[PDB]
Design a binder for these strands. Structure first.
Lengths: 131, 141, 136, 143, 38, 94
RNA sequence: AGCCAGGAUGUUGGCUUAGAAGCAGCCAUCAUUUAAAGAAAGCGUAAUAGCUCACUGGUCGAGUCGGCCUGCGCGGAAGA
């Protein structure tokens, strides 16, 4: 890794995703493994595809310095082994509930699903919406 | 639902786990059941085409109810198949020898797609081209 | 043991060594072992240093030996009274002025060179220092 | 023996600036006397031969493959080459001729040994047991 | 333990330590690496 | 880009030369063209750093002295026999 | 710098070797999911497994690291 260049550029990616993203989700592996990851991130790849990119760097002085511009509701996620995940490929997505079920199903947990707000949903699976 | 015990990934014959290294004490030090392994494997993989060392993962249960996990025969083996090569090179990328066809590998990268990393067959096809690096083969369109 | 191939004479005055190097700059490779010290390298010392150097760097990488003995050293036969003519030519040495480039290397990575020259210095008597080819 | 393009039995003489074996097949040059001049297929010296008279040359194979020279190379000496002696016994084919070339310009320790082979396979294992020894920085058929 | 005039780290675990001025090289790994003096 | 400050010397000669070189500054000279050859004292450290760049021996230097930003091409340098430090430099006026 | 987790997958890569699967030898030194994982840096097995590392994220949260140039010391350093 180099510096501010890539940092701020990955932040551009952030804005990119939030620019038309819906209910962004929180992500924080506690004790998961790469073998699982082979079909884990691959499964997000089966969700929207190139969507999920868990660029861990929840540093309050780093990724958080890049947060503000869009969905500042994201800050709350700052301290400890946490990260970010949006929903650019998904206006009005069900993508959020996927995390709940898996929160208690083979993944230990991922920030116990709480997300942010577009369809007015904190820790709440986006239930009342056409599939 | 058991996870850790004797779960190791080992290449084994698609329907011929009889030799010592493929079966023998290779799973013997791990203490794996030749018996039923044969019965079921054969009984079901007889329908499966034989002769190619497909990877399999031994998955043991609490009272020993095994689950062999065959993926897809080796890309190196698929290369021996579709490319029609019998051997790669003692010099991978130093002396490329086996002739190959991109689309063949792409469809074979679709089988491997059936089981790999991500979503796009093409990225997985690059992995197969990477496999071609691993063994030293001449590429052909 | 490098040795002068038949010189004009057989013996040479002890002389002195009040001076500085002439071949101070690295001449061929981009690496050299400049000698900080002021001494008298024996053929044995030189050849041995070469061996160790070479060993370290394998057969790859060209090497030069800037120094050559060309100084016969005579000595009296153990247990003979002073006088009775000058002693026998026991061996050969090369005078070394401070800053005298000794061995030079090229065709190999700086790191390995640094190590080979380390070993060379170890075998050698006089204190030395690592160097790199100067751009003019 | 050597099926010189659809006929065997033909008197020939093996070239001494190359070491043909039952592999790449062989180019056959027709000398004035001594009939045929097998020089292996593809070789620089062979090249000049073609250069002056292509017409008097036709191919040859092996029909139904012995004697060859090899250049092993060792690190200076101080004895570990004696180690090579020990290997003399393990080598199946009787060594035909010792030819060390430690000369050149440096401390190089090459040895041009001449031996034989019964099958190309066997040759494979030859190079293997030569490559094992650390002092054997090099070991290849001399041409 | 070794008692060299030229002690030096011998492995990754070797660690230089100056007890009462005498320089030493304690090592958590191989005890053999333990050496004094220098 | 190699800009360098430098003072005019006023004590040429081996004596002051070494007296100066001991003072972390060394004598060097600028000369070339109809202009009068000019003795130039200059700081050692800065140049010791500048030289590390090969361009220092190719790129036109811009020595500054009493406001005189004379440009000179690197010509020759007398490095110390072994001590990693300069003793004298030859700036071809350019 | 410590402390949390992970450090893979394709595929045990190919030649090869009974086996070389990260780790006998030689070549390859790619792809992928990647925050990160080298067909592997040390260890380990008959090969495996497995231990660790690089690397990446978390927290804490201020400098820290590697060389050079020199002053002064230390060790090297035992005799009747």
């Amino acid at each position: 890794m180099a510096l501010n260049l890539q940092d701020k550029q990955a932040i551009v990616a952030e804005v990119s995703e939030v620019a038309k993203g819906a209910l962004s989700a929180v992500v924080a592996d506690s004790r998961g493994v790469t073998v699982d990851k082979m079909t884990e991130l691959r499964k997000a790849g089966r969700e929207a595809g190139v969507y999920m990119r868990v660029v861990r760097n929840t540093l309050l002085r780093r990724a958080v310095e890049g947060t503000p511009f869009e969905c500042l509701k994201d800050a709350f996620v700052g301290p400890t082994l946490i990260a970010y995940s949006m929903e650019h490929p998904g206006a009005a997505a069900r993508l959020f509930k996927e995390f709940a079920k898996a929160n208690a199903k083979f993944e230990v947990k991922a920030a116990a699903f709480e997300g942010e707000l577009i369809p007015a949903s904190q820790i709440d699976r986006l239930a009342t919406l056409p599939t | 639902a058991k996870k850790v015990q004797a779960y190791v990934k080992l290449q084994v014959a698609a329907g011929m786990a009889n030799p010592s290294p493929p079966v023998g004490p290779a799973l013997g030090q791990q203490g794996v059941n030749i018996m039923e392994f044969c019965k079921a494997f054969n009984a079901k993989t007889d329908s499966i085409e034989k002769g190619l060392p497909i990877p399999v993962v031994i998955t043991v249960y609490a009272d020993r109810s095994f689950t062999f996990v065959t993926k897809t025969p080796p890309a190196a083996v698929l290369l021996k198949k579709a490319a029609g090569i019998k051997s790669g090179s003692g010099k991978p990328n130093k002396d490329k020898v086996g002739k190959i066809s991109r689309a063949q590998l792409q469809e074979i990268a679709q089988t491997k797609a059936a089981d790999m990393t991500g979503a796009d067959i093409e990225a997985m096809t690059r992995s197969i081209e990477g496999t071609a690096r691993s063994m030293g083969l001449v590429v052909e369109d | 043991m490098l040795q002068p191939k038949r010189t004009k004479f057989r013996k040479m005055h002890k002389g002195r060594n009040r001076g500085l190097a002439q071949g101070t700059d690295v001449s061929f490779g981009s690496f050299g072992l400049k000698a900080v010290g002021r001494g008298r390298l024996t053929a044995r010392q030189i050849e041995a240093a070469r061996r160790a150097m070479t060993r370290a760097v394998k057969r790859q990488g060209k090497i030069w030996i800037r120094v050559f003995p060309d100084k016969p050293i005579t000595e009296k036969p153990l247990a003979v009274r002073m006088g009775k003519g000058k002693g026998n030519v026991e061996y050969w040495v090369a005078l070394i002025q401070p800053g005298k480039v000794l061995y030079e290397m090229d065709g190999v990575p700086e790191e390995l060179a640094r190590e080979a020259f380390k070993l060379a210095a170890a075998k050698l008597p006089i204190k030395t220092t690592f160097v790199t080819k100067t751009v003019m | 023996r050597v099926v010189v393009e659809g006929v065997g039995n033909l008197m020939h003489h093996i070239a001494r600036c190359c070491q043909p074996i039952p592999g790449d097949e062989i180019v056959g040059f027709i000398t004035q006397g001594r009939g045929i001049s097998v020089h292996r297929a593809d070789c620089e010296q062979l090249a000049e031969l073609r250069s002056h008279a292509p017409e008097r040359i036709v191919d040859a194979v092996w029909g139904e493959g012995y004697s060859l020279v090899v250049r092993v190379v060792a690190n200076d000496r101080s004895g570990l080459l004696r180690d090579i002696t020990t290997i003399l016994a393990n080598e199946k084919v009787n060594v035909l001729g010792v030819a060390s070339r430690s000369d050149t310009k440096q401390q190089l320790a090459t040895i041009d040994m001449t031996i034989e082979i019964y099958n190309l396979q066997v040759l494979g294992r030859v190079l293997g047991k030569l490559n094992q020894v650390p002092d054997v920085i090099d070991a290849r058929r001399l041409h | 333990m070794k008692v060299r005039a030229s002690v030096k780290k011998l492995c990754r675990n070797c660690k230089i330590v100056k007890r009462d001025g005498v320089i030493r090289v304690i090592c958590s790994a191989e005890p053999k690496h333990k050496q004094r003096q220098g | 880009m190699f800009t360098i400050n430098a003072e005019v010397r006023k004590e040429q000669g081996k004596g002051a030369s070494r007296r100066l070189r001991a003072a972390n500054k060394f004598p060097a000279i600028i000369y070339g063209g109809k202009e009068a050859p000019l003795a130039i004292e200059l700081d050692h450290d800065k140049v010791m750093n500048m030289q590390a760049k090969a361009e220092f021996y190719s790129e036109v230097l811009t020595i500054v002295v009493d406001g005189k930003e004379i440009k000179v091409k690197a010509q020759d340098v007398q490095r110390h026999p072994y001590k990693p430090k300069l003793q004298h430099i030859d700036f071809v006026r350019a």
